[PDB]
Structure 1
Amino acid sequence: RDHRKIGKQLDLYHMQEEAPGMVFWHNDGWTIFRELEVFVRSKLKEYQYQEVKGPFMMDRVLWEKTGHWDNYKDAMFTTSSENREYCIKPMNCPGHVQIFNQGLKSYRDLPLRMAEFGSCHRNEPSGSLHGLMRVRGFTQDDAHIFCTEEQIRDEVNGCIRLVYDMYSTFGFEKIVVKLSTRPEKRIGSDEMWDRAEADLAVALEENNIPFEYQLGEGAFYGPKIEFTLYDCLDRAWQCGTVQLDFSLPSRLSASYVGEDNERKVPVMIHRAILGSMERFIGILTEEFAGFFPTWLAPVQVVIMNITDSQSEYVNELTQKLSNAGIRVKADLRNEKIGFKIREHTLRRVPYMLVCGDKEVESGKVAVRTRRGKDLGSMDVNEVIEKLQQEIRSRSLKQLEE
């Protein structure tokens, strides 16, 4: 179904009018959000990315330089103190550059992979807003790569590979590529865009990724490979993206030293795998439709007693499981077990554990997937070791399926 509903459904979040296009991440939604971060971190570790964090706003003067002010100022939010006037960051590109500029960087510091779960803000037109897909305030999972241009290849490829290798974890079928070309208001010489565009295209076809030119689209600062995923109504949504920047690195004057002990402006690659935390979450919801894989489930397990007897043996287990590091909860409520199983199933809990008198003098637990498949009572540790296995591997399929 529609994420917006499943969201209200599973208490993943909510939104209010006094905060248009601003998400009020509820506890459970958060968990998903958060759990995604840990995932990203994980994938990035291999490729050795640096995780930074930039200012929530900088001086308007800065953006004037980058170009944002002259071709984006309409989507930019702004405040100011007695001091100057600042823009709330739309992207984290400028920021990263600043951090890059501290000190003298040699070619040997390249390629420089700097990532950040950067919180952005954009004055998206009232009309264009939509659930977690198109919001005024989101969180990119981007990074920017500083590198020589011989590095551009391997560098871009690594990105691509990362997008697929990562999306694959969610088992996405529809992944269509687009290659947006020099937009109306760009900032580099055609000569630059020529190379930039070529480079990207070459990359695609060099990995045999089929695509179409998004002609007239793309960063005001460079060509842009777009990875689009689709939703409930098979509507296209841009999620991942790899952009080749030739201006900015110079505009904010960054540079490194070659062996020729010479000043060289680095090349800068923009890129976000999931794209935007809220948007990508929206898609996951859309896909699985409330059936987030065990690892990504707000609540992973539910242990319930049949009568007010085994209620202690339930607290017992919910405990052992909580230490096991499993998002578990106990439904000891005074209700018919049938009810419990109901509520939680439309709640989507990957696993439900029934504890009746029978199981108490067994140390066993009546296991049952949300899908309904009664997995039959089984050893405690057993369920744990197995759940952990399923979570640890962020596997999509549950036990016995």
Structure 2
Amino acid sequence: MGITADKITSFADWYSQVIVKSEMIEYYDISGCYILRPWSYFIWETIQSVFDQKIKQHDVQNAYFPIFVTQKKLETEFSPEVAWVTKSGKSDLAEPIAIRPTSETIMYPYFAKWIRSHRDLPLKINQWTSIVRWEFKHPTPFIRTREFLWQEGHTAHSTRKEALEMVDIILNEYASIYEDLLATPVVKGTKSENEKFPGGDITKSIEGFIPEIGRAVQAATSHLLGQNFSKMFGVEFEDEKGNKEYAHQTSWGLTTRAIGVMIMTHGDNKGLVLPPKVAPVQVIIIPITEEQKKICNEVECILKKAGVRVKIDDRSNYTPGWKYNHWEVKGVCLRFEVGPRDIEKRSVRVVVRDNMEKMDIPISELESKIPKLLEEFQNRLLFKAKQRQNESIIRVDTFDKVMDTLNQKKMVIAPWCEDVSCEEEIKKETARLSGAMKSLCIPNDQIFKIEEGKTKCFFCDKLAKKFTLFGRSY
């Protein structure tokens, strides 16, 4: 089978067939829960190892804290989306316990106990875990699940300056995970006061955007918590002159959401298209079997010494047409066809997945040439998704064009006053008129200028502080 829904006009059906026929996902009989079959789980394992290697270079250490937390401890800080354990076997528990929705209330009482002097700082912890949250919005594979996988990092420092720089380091690593690994463009910025994590001072984030349906997605985040939680839990150290001070904290997380943004970004009407740095198989060799079976395996050896993941499909019970569609659906980058005249010429017929480009390549040039085609594919995918991200951002300086452009499926960049009240009104109005539009982020990179004391909010009557990105959110 092939894909029978169109990406642009039947997106939901398209996304569903693509993740099921590729064997990325299976649907389960508890709503919002999804099985990650090997084909998608390989992508998560790759993300794990690249990010892990990065944080190790800034001395983050891995640990594992428990999945349960008591209500006493959870209700020190959100509650209707928490799952509670009340029973073991048939008999009621004397008091209920919560499955972990995040680890602050599990971890921080122990930070208080371990930290006594500036010499115990910095303290940098990370754990890879699963998380449960009882979502009220409708679920969607990867993007919004009841159980998801993530890492959560939690640091403590002696100055604000050192904590803020760790916030920024992590935010850059996250951007690199999306751009360099997943070939998915993202926009770095700061969250408005209405949209930030309420238990912290600042929240930075990366935003991405699915152009076929007009919706922004928050792709990862990184908080300067400051002294908010350190006062709340008693996290304090003796400085050099004997004086107790409250530590300056950060936290940050990234989830399997990443995998879904990537699929929705690169996929087409024939199936998955995958970045070669995360594709479980990059090259599949299909012979049209006598001296064929010797040339196939020579080609395999060559690619394997070179570091390329390659398989041969030499099954007798399938048409070459069937095979072509099977590996296309699974997003294999390169497809080598090997028949009689390919043997006769000592060369391989190549078809490139994302563009349908055909090429013949002598065998003695494979060692050099294939690694280099894979680097080109990786760069072409990021370059195209970025151009489409740019086509989707429209500058507006007043309210009158907004609704026209949200209905073309776009994001808005607009000068803005950043007040909470202003944001709440924008929301009410856009909803009424359509569905609501919210602030996504204030981009770190301001490609457009504020004339000092002349430029107005695009909505309120006040003066603008900066330009800000707005749109409808997944």
Q: Secondary structure at the match of 2:208?
A: strand
Aligned to 1:175: 187
**Cα distance between partner residues in 2 of 1:393 and 1:330:** 23
Structure 2 letter corresponding to 1:332: D
Identify which of 65, 76, 83 aligns with 1:77. 83
Deviation at 1:296, TM superposition (A): 1.2
| Aligned partner letter, 1:276 | T
| TM alignment of 1:76-155, pairs within 5 A | 76-80=82-86, 82=93, 84-97=95-108, 100-101=111-112, 103-125=114-136, 127-148=137-158, 149-155=160-166
For the 8 Å contact 2:60–2:124, the answer to whether it is kept is yes
Any idea what SS the aligned residue of 2:261 has?
helix
Q: Which residue of 1 aligns with 2:423?
A: none
Alpha-carbon distance in structure 2 between the residues aligned to 1:161 and 1:155? 10
Q: Give distance in 2, aligned partners of 1:42 and 1:265.
A: 30
Distance 1:60 1:365 in 2: 64
Report the AA paired with residue 356 of structure 1: G
What 5-or-longer segments of structure 2 have no aligned partner?
A: 1-6, 385-474
- Map of 2:246 onto structure 1: 265
Correspondence for 1:230 among 201, 209, 223? 209
Q: Distance in 2 between matches of 1:141 and 1:388?
A: 31
Measured against aligned partners, the alpha-carbon deviations of 1:317-361 in whole angstroms (never above 9, x if no partner) come to: 546655765432221122443443343234321011223345557
Residue 328 of structure 2 aligns with an amino acid whose one-letter code is T
**Cα distance in structure 1, aligned partners of 2:139 and 2:113:** 38
Q: Does 1:375 align with 2:359?
A: yes
Q: Deviations over 1:167-206 (max 9, x none)?
A: 332454452645242xxxxxxxxxxxxxxxxxxxxxxxxx
1:327 maps to 2:309: yes
TM-score (norm 2): 0.65
Indicate the residue corresponding to 2:260 in structure 1.
282
Aligned 8 A contact 2:115 2:235 in 1: no
Change in Cα spacing, 1:41 to 1:387, as seen in structure 2 (3 Å) is farther
Aligned CA-pair RMSD: 3.2
Instruction: Work out the number of aligned pairs and report it.
Output: 354
Q: Is 1:351 the counterpart of 2:334 in the alignment?
A: yes
Alpha-carbon distance in 2 for matches of 1:256, 1:48: 20
| Counterpart contact for 2:23–2:39, Cα < 8 Å | yes
Secondary structure of the structure 2 residue equivalent to 1:314:
helix
Q: Pick the aligned partner of 1:219 from 197, 208, 211.
A: 197
Identity among equivalent positions (%) equals 19
Higher strand content, 1 or 2: 2
- Displacement of 1:287 in angstroms is 0.7
Q: Do the aligned residues in 1 keep the contact of 2:302 with 2:366 (CA within 8 Å)?
A: no
Q: Indicate which of 278, 298, 303 corresponds to 2:280.
A: 298
Give the Cα–Cα distance (whole angstroms) in 2 for the partners of residues 364 and 107 of structure 1: 65
Match of 1:64 among 56, 70, 75: 75
2:461 alignment partner in structure 1: none
- Which residue is equivalent to 2:459? none
Give the secondary structure class of the aligned counterpart of 1:377: strand
Provide the residue aligned with 2:52 in structure 1.
41
Q: CA 1:86–1:250 in structure 2 vs 1: closer, same or farther (change >3 Å)?
A: farther
CA distance in structure 1 between the partners assigned to 2:109 and 2:55 by the alignment: 22
Query: Quick check: 387-396 or 247-256, which moved more?
Result: 387-396
Worse-matched range after superposition: 41-50 or 233-242: 41-50
Any conservation in 1 of the 2:303–2:366 contact (CA below 8 Å)? no
Gaps spanning 5+ residues in structure 1: where? 182-214
**Residue 13 of structure 1: which of 17, 25, 32 is its match?**
25
Q: CA deviation at 1:146?
A: 1.0
> 1:244 aligns to what?
224
Partner of 2:411: none
1:360 & 1:92 partners in 2: Cα distance? 59
Do the aligned residues in 2 keep the contact of 1:180 with 1:225 (CA within 8 Å)? no
Structure 2 partner of 1:340? 323
- The separation in 1 between residues aligned to 2:366 and 2:65, in whole angstroms, is 43
Shift of 1:90: 0.7
**3-state SS, counterpart of residue 35 of structure 2:** coil
**Against the structure 1 CA distance between its residues 128 and 341, is the aligned structure 2 distance closer, same or farther, given a 3 Å change threshold?**
closer
Q: 1:392 to 1:368 in 2, by over 3 A?
A: closer
Q: Secondary structure at the match of 2:135?
A: coil
Checking the alignment, whether the CA contact within 8 Å between 1:359 and 1:377 is kept in structure 2 is no
